Amino acid sequence: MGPIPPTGVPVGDFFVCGRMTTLHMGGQSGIQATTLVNGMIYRTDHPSPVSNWEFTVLENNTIVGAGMGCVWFQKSEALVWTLDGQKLSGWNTLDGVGTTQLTVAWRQHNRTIYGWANVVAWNSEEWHTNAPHQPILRLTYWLVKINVLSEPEDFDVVQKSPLAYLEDYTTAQSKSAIQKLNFQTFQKPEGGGTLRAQYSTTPRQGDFAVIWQIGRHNFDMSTGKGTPVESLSDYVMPQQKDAHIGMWYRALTSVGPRTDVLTLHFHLP
Amino acid sequence: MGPIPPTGVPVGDFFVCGRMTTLHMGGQSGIQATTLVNGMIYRTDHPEPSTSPVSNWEFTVLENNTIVGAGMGCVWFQKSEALVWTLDGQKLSGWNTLDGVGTTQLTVAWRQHNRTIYGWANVVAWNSEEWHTNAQPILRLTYWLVKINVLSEPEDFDVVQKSPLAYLEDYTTAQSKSAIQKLNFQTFQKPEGGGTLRAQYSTTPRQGDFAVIWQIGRHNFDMSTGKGTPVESLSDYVMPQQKDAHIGMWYRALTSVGPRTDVLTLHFHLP
């Protein structure tokens, strides 16, 4: 027996495993941005309507989600498979996968690319937080297929990042809150309240990306539509989370390499 | 082809994808420890008397009663809930199981609060990846897949713990100046103080379960033998160039916070 080549589009809910490259790293002009992997562009001034984050998921002109992070990959290196229990039911490719009518708008430095990508599939997972009408914290991600080649300009902008909630802080030691997730502004060492979005290689037409948001929002697994996260602060998580969707460490780390391998799992409409 | 059941042990380098549970979360007596997933127990005082050399970290990898590595993190999983496969390029060369996988003679000693469990696990396979600093040994992330030999219930205890984070200056909880090229590791202490953090243990793996132990920091490692040096201590590091990594452990190893369990995708050189 020789090896099985990847063939056909996934039938039903599926897994994607690949090296996924962070769209931009957090920097300062003239300094290569090598570790700040979760700088999330946050812009409340606005120029279809857009969210407060870099990406906006749209049904026509209605915001149904936001993207505060983005990793991308080409179809050639991604592993794609489906399971029947523990049995392998398909060893597939993303070549020719269908898309939904949900679109993604990309807000760049001084322009917005509407129709930049279309949503293919998605996943989401909640983690109960202390609060009443407020949605609990959720991590939602969408697989998207890029429609157009757009080259983004690097620019300095307010960026939020996850971290532990630290008090009595020095670089050598701090008091770490036992139950908290924090999100704060990371500014560049020269100041200004902003951090440079230093873009790397960017997806082209037919490439794929995963965009995600984390924070208080609602989401409908059956349709891929929810609400955009409005803003980020600190959250108390009173119970353990034994999660399933595979994005949590990538979404919550303060530092990391620009690219690493991730396996994500996706639901179709 | 109809659906293929997992069949046979992996031959050659292989992948494992599954939900992996953090061995202990960073806490304080009486408070459920729900987010601090990278409290790494740091003890420079060697157990005395000791029948083997011991690292400064929770786990010591041993061969011929000599240190060949250390473990500062541990995630564990049951084999019945892991995907295991081998590749030839992008082609699938095996859809496998860890049932009946062979082990090496490299062992893992687990230093608990007041005892060390020798032979707690045997090494099955390993991987490692470097990331050059601006500097001595290179900064590396190294991990071993291990098969647990015994259920050894640990006692929760307060101890010095180090965690990764961004290098932050001019810090408040709302905003800080984040160094552009740095990784930092610092002591995280519980809010009640004392310089220590509680290791709050989860369910303990039993014989036949699997775990992944890893170390990050300056050390040497030989992919051909699975042996290297233990990381001695952790500080801050300047990374002058981008790292495009692939061993799948970097975000789990560098995050300051997270859920106790999530899916990870790792791959291993099998001796």
Residue numbers in the entry:
A (entry chain C): 406 to 452, 457 to 540, 543 to 680
B (entry chain A): 406 to 540, 545 to 680
Which sentences from the paper describe this structure?
The HAstV capsid precursor protein comprises several domains, including a highly basic amino terminus that binds to the RNA genome, a core domain that forms the icosahedral shell, a spike domain that forms dimeric protrusions, and an acidic domain with unknown function at the carboxy terminus. The HAstV-VA1 spike forms a dimer and shares a core beta-barrel structure with other astrovirus capsid spikes but is otherwise strikingly different, suggesting that HAstV-VA1 may utilize a different cell receptor, and an infection competition assay supports this hypothesis. Also similar to other HAstV spikes, the structural domain of each protomer of the HAstV-VA1 spike comprises a core antiparallel beta-barrel, formed by beta-strands 1, 9, 10, 16, and 18.
The HAstV-VA1neuro capsid spike structure provided a guide to generate a new construct encoding only the amino acids that form the HAstV-VA1 spike structural domain (residues 408–684), and this construct yielded a soluble protein in E. coli. We then used this strategy to generate a construct encoding the capsid spike structural domain from a gastrointestinal HAstV-VA1 (HAstV-VA1gastro) identified in 2008 in an individual with acute gastroenteritis. This recombinant HAstV-VA1gastro capsid spike protein forms a dimer in solution, consistent with other HAstV capsid spikes. The HAstV-VA1gastro capsid spike was then crystallized and its structure was solved to 1.46 Å resolution. Finally, to evaluate if there are structural changes in the spike that drive infection of the CNS, we aligned the HAstV-VA1gastro and HAstV-VA1neuro spike structures, which resulted in an RMSD of 0.78 Å and TM-score of 0.97, revealing that no major structural differences are observed. Statistical analyses confirm that there is a significant decrease in antibody binding to the HAstV-VA1neuro spike compared to the HAstV-VA1gastro spike.
